[PDB]
């Protein structure tokens, strides 16, 4: 019922998957930030 | 070795290769069409039956099933 629907069968060759490594590190995946909320959270709690 | 030589009455039959070479690329009315003299001799043709579907399961080739 995968050759009728045109799907790949679960046995033989389609018993696994190949996926491609992105070869990326955690240094490029950083939340870059400069003076966004450095004071907008500071000037909202003074005596209120 | 000594070789057995002499005449034999041979005979040429029907069933030549010029009216049996049959091929097809894409679409109906195949481009290499044989002569239409079958006479209760439909031996499948350019098909892929369920007996041939069972042979490629034993190989395990899953990407040839979707292609054919």
From Swiss-Prot, chain A:
Name of the featured protein: DNA-directed RNA polymerase III subunit RPC1
Family statement drawn from the similarity comment of this UniProt entry: Belongs to the RNA polymerase beta' chain family.
Organism lineage: Eukaryota, Fungi, Dikarya, Ascomycota, Saccharomycotina
The protein's assembly and partners: Component of the RNA polymerase III (Pol III) complex consisting of 17 subunits.
Additional note from the record: Present with 6020 molecules/cell in log phase SD medium.
Record's subcellular location: Nucleus
Function comment: DNA-dependent RNA polymerase catalyzes the transcription of DNA into RNA using the four ribonucleoside triphosphates as substrates. Largest and catalytic core component of RNA polymerase III which synthesizes small RNAs, such as 5S rRNA and tRNAs. Forms the polymerase active center together with the second largest subunit. A single-stranded DNA template strand of the promoter is positioned within the central active site cleft of Pol III.
Organism from which the protein derives: Saccharomyces cerevisiae (strain ATCC 204508 / S288c) (Baker's yeast)
Positions of disulphide bridges: none
Curated annotation (Swiss-Prot), chain B:
Subcellular localization, as worded in the UniProt entry: Nucleus
Coiled-coil positions: none
Highest taxon in the source lineage: Eukaryota
Note: Present with 1950 molecules/cell in log phase SD medium.
Family per similarity comment: Belongs to the RNA polymerase beta chain family.
Job description of the protein: DNA-dependent RNA polymerase catalyzes the transcription of DNA into RNA using the four ribonucleoside triphosphates as substrates. Second largest core component of RNA polymerase III which synthesizes small RNAs, such as 5S rRNA and tRNAs. Proposed to contribute to the polymerase catalytic activity and forms the polymerase active center together with the largest subunit. Pol III is composed of mobile elements and RPC2 is part of the core element with the central large cleft and probably a clamp element that moves to open and close the cleft.
Full protein name: DNA-directed RNA polymerase III subunit RPC2
Organism: Saccharomyces cerevisiae (strain ATCC 204508 / S288c)
Gene name as annotated: RET1
């Amino acid at each position: 019922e995968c050759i009728i629907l045109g799907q790949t069968m679960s046995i033989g060759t389609g018993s696994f998957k190949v996926v491609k490594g992105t070869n990326i590190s955690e240094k490029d995946l950083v939340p870059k930030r400069c003076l966004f909320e450095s004071l907008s959270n500071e000037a909202a709690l003074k005596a209120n | 070795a000594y070789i057995f030589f002499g005449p034999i009455y041979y005979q040429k039959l029907k069933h030549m290769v010029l009216d049996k070479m049959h091929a097809r690329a894409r679409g109906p009315r195949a481009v290499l069409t044989r002569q239409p003299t079958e006479g209760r001799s439909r031996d499948g043709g350019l098909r892929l039956g369920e007996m041939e579907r069972d042979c490629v399961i034993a190989y395990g080739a899953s990407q040839l099933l979707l292609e054919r």
